[PDB]
Amino acid sequence: NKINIGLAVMKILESWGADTIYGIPSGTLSSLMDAMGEEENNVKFLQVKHEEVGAMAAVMQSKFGGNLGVTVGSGGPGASHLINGLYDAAMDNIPVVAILGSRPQRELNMDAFQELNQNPMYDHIAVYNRRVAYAEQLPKLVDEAARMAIAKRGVAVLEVPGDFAKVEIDNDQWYSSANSLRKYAPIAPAAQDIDAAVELLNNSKRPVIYAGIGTMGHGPAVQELARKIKAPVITTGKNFETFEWDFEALTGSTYRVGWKPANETILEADTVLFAGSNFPFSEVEGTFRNVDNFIQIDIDPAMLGKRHHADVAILGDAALAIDEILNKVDAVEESAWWTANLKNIANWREYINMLETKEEGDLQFYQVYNAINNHADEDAIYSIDVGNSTQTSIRHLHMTPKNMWRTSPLFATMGIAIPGGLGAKNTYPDRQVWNIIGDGAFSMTYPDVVTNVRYNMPVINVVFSNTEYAFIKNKYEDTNKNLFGVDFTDVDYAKIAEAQGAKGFTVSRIEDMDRVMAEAVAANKAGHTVVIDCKITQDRPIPVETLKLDSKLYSEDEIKAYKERYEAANLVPFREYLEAEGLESKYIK
Amino acid sequence: NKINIGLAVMKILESWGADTIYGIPSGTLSSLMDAMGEEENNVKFLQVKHEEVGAMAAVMQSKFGGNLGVTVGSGGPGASHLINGLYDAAMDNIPVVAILGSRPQRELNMDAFQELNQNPMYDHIAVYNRRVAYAEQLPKLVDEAARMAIAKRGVAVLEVPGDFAKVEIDNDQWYSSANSLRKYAPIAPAAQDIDAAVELLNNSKRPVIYAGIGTMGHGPAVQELARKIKAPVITTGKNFETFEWDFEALTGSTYRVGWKPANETILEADTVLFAGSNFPFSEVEGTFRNVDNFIQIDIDPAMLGKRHHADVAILGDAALAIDEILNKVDAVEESAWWTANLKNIANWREYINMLETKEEGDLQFYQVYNAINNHADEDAIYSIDVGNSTQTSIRHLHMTPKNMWRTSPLFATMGIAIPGGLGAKNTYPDRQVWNIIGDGAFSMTYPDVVTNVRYNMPVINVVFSNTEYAFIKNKYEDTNKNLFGVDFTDVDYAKIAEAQGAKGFTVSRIEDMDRVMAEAVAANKAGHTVVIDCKITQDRPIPVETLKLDSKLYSEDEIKAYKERYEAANLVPFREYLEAEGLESKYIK
Amino acid sequence: NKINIGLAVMKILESWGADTIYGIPSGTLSSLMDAMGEEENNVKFLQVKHEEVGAMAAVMQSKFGGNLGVTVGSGGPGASHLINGLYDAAMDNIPVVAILGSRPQRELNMDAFQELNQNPMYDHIAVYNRRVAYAEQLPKLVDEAARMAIAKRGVAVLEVPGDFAKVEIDNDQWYSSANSLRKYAPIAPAAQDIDAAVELLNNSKRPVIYAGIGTMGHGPAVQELARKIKAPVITTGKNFETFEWDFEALTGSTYRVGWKPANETILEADTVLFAGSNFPFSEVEGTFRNVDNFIQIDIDPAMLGKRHHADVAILGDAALAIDEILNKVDAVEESAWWTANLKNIANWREYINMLETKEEGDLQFYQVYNAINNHADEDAIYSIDVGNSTQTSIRHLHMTPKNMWRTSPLFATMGIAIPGGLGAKNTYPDRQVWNIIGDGAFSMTYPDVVTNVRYNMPVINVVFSNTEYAFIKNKYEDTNKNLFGVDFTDVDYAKIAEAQGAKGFTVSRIEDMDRVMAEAVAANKAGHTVVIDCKITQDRPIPVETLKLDSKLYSEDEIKAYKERYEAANLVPFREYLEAEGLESKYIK
Numbered sequence A, B, C: 001n002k003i004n005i006g007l008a009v010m011k012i013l014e015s016w017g018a019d020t021i022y023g024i025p026s027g028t029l030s031s032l033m034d035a036m037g038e039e040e041n042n043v044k045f046l047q048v049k050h051e052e053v054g055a056m057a058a059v060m061q062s063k064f065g066g067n068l069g070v071t072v073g074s075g076g077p078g079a080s081h082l083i084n085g086l087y088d089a090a091m092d093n094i095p096v097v098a099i100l101g102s103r104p105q106r107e108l109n110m111d112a113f114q115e116l117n118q119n120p121m122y123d124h125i126a127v128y129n130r131r132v133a134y135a136e137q138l139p140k141l142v143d144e145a146a147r148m149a150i151a152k153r154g155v156a157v158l159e160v161p162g163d164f165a166k167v168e169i170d171n172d173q174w175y176s177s178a179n180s181l182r183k184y185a186p187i188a189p190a191a192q193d194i195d196a197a198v199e200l201l202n203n204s205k206r207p208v209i210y211a212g213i214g215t216m217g218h219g220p221a222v223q224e225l226a227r228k229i230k231a232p233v234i235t236t237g238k239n240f241e242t243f244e245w246d247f248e249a250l251t252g253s254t255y256r257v258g259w260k261p262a263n264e265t266i267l268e269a270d271t272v273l274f275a276g277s278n279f280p281f282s283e284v285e286g287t288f289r290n291v292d293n294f295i296q297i298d299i300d301p302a303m304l305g306k307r308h309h310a311d312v313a314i315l316g317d318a319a320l321a322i323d324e325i326l327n328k329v330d331a332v333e334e335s336a337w338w339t340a341n342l343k344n345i346a347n348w349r350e351y352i353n354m355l356e357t358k359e360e361g362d363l364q365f366y367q368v369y370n371a372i373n374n375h376a377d378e379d380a381i382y383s384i385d386v387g388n389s390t391q392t393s394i395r396h397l398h399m400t401p402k403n404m405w406r407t408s409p410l411f412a413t414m415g416i417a418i419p420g421g422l423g424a425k426n427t428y429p430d431r432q433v434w435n436i437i438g439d440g441a442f443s444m445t446y447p448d449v450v451t452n453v454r455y456n457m458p459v460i461n462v463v464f465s466n467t468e469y470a471f472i473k474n475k476y477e478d479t480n481k482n483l484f485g486v487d488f489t490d491v492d493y494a495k496i497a498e499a500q501g502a503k504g505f506t507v508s509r510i511e512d513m514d515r516v517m518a519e520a521v522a523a524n525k526a527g528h529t530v531v532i533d534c535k536i537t538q539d540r541p542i543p544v545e546t547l548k549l550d551s552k553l554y555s556e557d558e559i560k561a562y563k564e565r566y567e568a569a570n571l572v573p574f575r576e577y578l579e580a581e582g583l584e585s586k587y588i589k
Ligand SMILES: Cc1cc2nc3c(=O)[nH]c(=O)nc-3n(C[C@H](O)[C@H](O)[C@H](O)COP(=O)(O)OP(=O)(O)OC[C@H]3O[C@@H](n4cnc5c(N)ncnc54)[C@H](O)[C@@H]3O)c2cc1C
Pocket: A211, A212, A213, A214, A215, A235, A236, A237, A238, A239, A253, A254, A255, A256, A257, A258, A275, A276, A277, A278, A279, A280, A297, A298, A299, A300, A303, A316, A317, A318, A319, A386, A387, A391, A407, A408, A409, A410, A412
């Protein structure tokens, strides 16, 4: 009883649940692909236009809760095109199997055509990186690659000479260890550490909960704890979906891609409950410079006390920890700290709502997000690209745990949106998927819009056309001293979409946004991939990391100019709200 | 309130329990070392003669249950000398902090004297590998390096420009996260998996327990389980101390560095309980080629089903798993399989004992080990080097859990013995420490014998002088086809020892061994480091991976020659014992 | 017609002149070594005690003008032990072939015993780094490795699975490209650039010639040019042998390992003729801070204008360039600049000679060098280790082009002396070879003294025993602010030497030095390797990089203390000599 090595490989991938391979077919990968669909195998190939899109899609697939992704790249240039997707997965600790094709074994080291040592290529970021030495061990290595990708939460790479998959072996000369896959259940926290945390929280006059994705799946519990001890909630740029968008005590996120409330709260807080987070701006932006006590909860020992000295360290699942704390902590009836924060939050929501609900004028991204909120399904999935217009989505999207919002948050590679949409739609074929993209990022990946069309994976692409980079337009004055230089004409994305078999729309006026969005959604429900080219203004989101509103921190002229520029006449500095409740700023003046 | 960065670094190391730095002082490391012993700091420097010895000692320190080790290497050649120690730690998953000195910041990239990019040097094996960008962050990075070394169980590397440690900072500009150190407690296994294991064990006619270091600390329980279900025990080359050397059912280890019983048992077994092991020879030597069922217990998901398909996979602490299995499994009163094995083991012990107890003649390593057994403390520590004479120690040393036996088991670097002795003696100053070394390995490290002398860390070095490499003398016929070529004259190690301030002994006769060993131990108890130059024969340990004893596997001539060569006339093939109990070989004929 | 791959490999090495392989025999290298000496092959194996010594010897062999060296390291720890030797070769641009042994092909990627990916190990420093993919291509790759090592002037690395060399192939399936070896002849400089150089030299009032090893073989011409235009000569730490030690206008080298004259001259010069040098201290020590014009000659375009802006750049052989300049430049009859320099040099020689010729007292390295000068052959070879006592040899050894002086000048790895002696003696069996070593460096390599003994390669080891590191004792005050901490007892090296089959001597008094040196040389001429343990004082060489002698640069107290400490009462600051000739310092005051 013999079996083709390529088929054995497909059977192994199938056993691990990796039923989708992303890439472009070619010579150095043909032997493997030729076995797909054989003997009832269910592994399918999803062909992309650029390998980086395939790599990112394989990765985003897991981020969205899908199966283990597999991405391939032909010897040399195909393999190197995977880099942005693999680095993203490495930094986000996302499991993914990358198979690098290669010239046949006989050609290795001969300086043959497109023949090179690809082992160095991804050695720095991989959790597994090997060049298959002979055909007969390919199955064992693919099996281990999957096992390692999952166990080590990262990129497992295999360089495979193109002649190996054609070889035949005895069926008893291969096996899958997928049946032995086991994962650790939630780890219960140490009572000693939970008690120390409870004591600090009980004695704090200004507690604040800072929740990262470690709290995913436990938003209701966090909101319950927040209300019990009257502690406002701050979230991370990756964790907005965990909370009800309209939660009374949600202050948003800190720093640039955040809200005004969160940025003011963290500088006035006394005790922080850092739950399931590895906020990267912590040290360099002095996020916790005014905090007195720091309590951290995490399942990874490497993270304990990393972003700030921890007065209390809790090793364990955030869910279990939050529950234990919720049960032991004292209830707080009233709090000036809480009252002041709720008003500060309400003030901010009045501002955001007024921008979103404008009725006429030149289109701004604010109204595009408004239209999305008015037409999106309650369980819609959002694949967000990297840029100023897209990341500001967290100030507008009315999400809940029913949604999923993913991007490239740390490596922050542009072009992640479209790949994300493919991974999502592949995992949830009957679910509404949105790709929110800036024109710069769209320009790096729009050729792959045809991929959604060809594979009947309908998505809604929302493109923000604002000529010059909005975000980049904010780093030649706040850091530099000269002008700018980031111009771009204006290509017709809607026309390009039509040329690709997709449905294109173009909108540039607030009064036309709702209708255009309605037609776009209806078109998507008819099974079409759509591209909405939103010609927006040059307006930038109000800089919440530099709030020029407090008269004790900035001059009248500054405040006046700041308000006029961002239409923020009605925003009120947090200190006013603190003082209105009988409290005083702990750092201002 | 200011503080020297070097001192802050020492305070951090002290907080993590890393109170010993191994290396050689010099310019590119002086700024750091100059702060040692300041403001009551207790971090001490242990100066070696070769940096590789310092690196290996820092690593072996942890292997022996000591504190986190720190090793330093001066810019360029000092740092590169650490390689063998770091690779060993990487492959053994042992935490260790390596600090690479470097030319001052101003000289970087200038192609100055001894100035180079050292980031590539250890990037492949490190769990952390960074070049400090500016003086003020050195404390934070040393703190994280320790946190990462421990959490990731590996090598954390920092390249430190020599001018950084001289800089001063505010005391509030640094902190240690050592107080937040937390580790996961033993993980309880899934009842479902324990039950599946119990069912297989209950229905097995020939069960065998294969225990690796995952069972460290639970030998009594394993021995109890072995007796309850009448399953012989096989151990790994790293796990002998876990069992009482004279346990009735201990068959030893498989393959070359093993015993005859274990090698025959594994080929006749039906069900294997692979507990806490990652035996590297599994696949390439077909260790489990005749097994029917395979049950594996491990705390690392990456290992489940790695060395063989697992019919049952148990994720969890070996201790807890063994206890649960012991409690649920059915007791077995009698077993022909067990009886046959006990006799096979007894036959082997008769052979080994007869070699160890010879009374007169040219010295063989067998009698050296006999002398060690007759004079060593019950809690003696053994630091074993890499070679034929030293590794065969597991066939002779009468150990128990009261002992510790460590070597370089996977990377297998020669020269690990002396460094191991330093790490051990540093951790246990009042405990008997033995370094068992071959002359080849001794020749790579004997200059450091002076280190034990100078720091008053008395150890007993036992050197096997056999001219040509015993092990290497067995790879020019069993693999090659030509002669050999591994000669060495015979230097006077005892004389060298005296020249270094140590006490030297020379012995070449069996009838002189006991007295020499007695004087050596007495000398060590007087506070002296000793070197026993054992001039042994060219005799090689009987090859248990190729037992030429069964008349159905080898010819009369072969058996006759095999017996005469290894004085094994009385060894009896396991099949005879199986048949004597009414059983039949499952593979022979 | 078939041939063993191992033999084909040896035939190829032989054709490239690589007739000596350094290393230690073992399993993963046996297949290759088993073919040595077959079918009249003349490649021999030189067995060392530590692989780093083998690597360094293979490299030093070429530095001393020998054949292409080959060094081997067994899979894992053997290969990693080569690092210090390979990094040295990489930084010095010395050709060398390194063969890394490896577990058999079938074991690769199986996580077998001592099995690992060694491709990352030396990728950063190698000019060629490949893992042989299959047995049949081994010959082609060894051939290319030699071709690349030589053409790229660096380290060519091949990882070779241990089972490949055993395979047989058709004799017509391999060939050597050694017959096609071709090298570029000296490149003639552009007349345009030579003329620009001549013009500057002609118009300079204070010309100085700074000669690096690019001038090797052309010292007489440089000395002739120096005299013709009356330009003093400065040499590099690697180029002393190029000049007659007593040349009237030789000022020595600049910075720490240099002479007083050179250090003062460079700061007073106007035009520098930088010939064949890449002096690493140039920028970081501001060597040329006071120069007005800079003319550089080099055969490597990458070096032109590297160490300083070049007013004139000459691409070409230093010999040809010097000759063209010598022929076109104007002769200079007299020069105050020249006269002042000759007197400054003479003053320095009076100082050095008085220290070297002391008659009685505690031994200092000065008198050891004196004894060497009085007994060494005119064509003696000097292998110098890294340290304060050894590098200061350039202030004392009376060398000429008949000698060869080599060390590890840039990577600066300690332990280079003994390996250098092996490479030298292997290349010149009937030539006197000296290894000058500090006790610290000796302690990292003395086990290999037995290698010279066993292979009958008689060398004279001169060891400076000064307890604490002399050089290191000068970096805890001139850079740090605390005490020191670099103590070492005092082992009996002479006794160790005797134990190794060598002849040991011990000397600690000036009045005994000549006799001891005489007996040592006579013993070496009797075919014995000798070890002279020179117990010297703690005295440090006078710091020429910080001359506290000029009353306009330092205080009376400083000058007085400086003179008393270094017995330099009679040294006169260069400015006095300049002013005596009617000139003025261009920077002092
Ligand atoms: C252009 C751009 C701008 C951005 N701007 C901002 C900004 O202004 N503000 C902002 O906040 N973000 C911003 N981000 C996102 C930011 O870079 C980070 O990716 C994000 O804040 C990290 O969020 P996190 O801490 O929730 O999760 P991660 O960094 O993913 O860390 C999660 C932590 O939770 C732990 N964990 C996981 N599971 C559990 C469990 N069950 N129990 C306990 N612990 C668990 C993990 O071990 C880990 O330590 C931006 C991103 C981009 C691309």
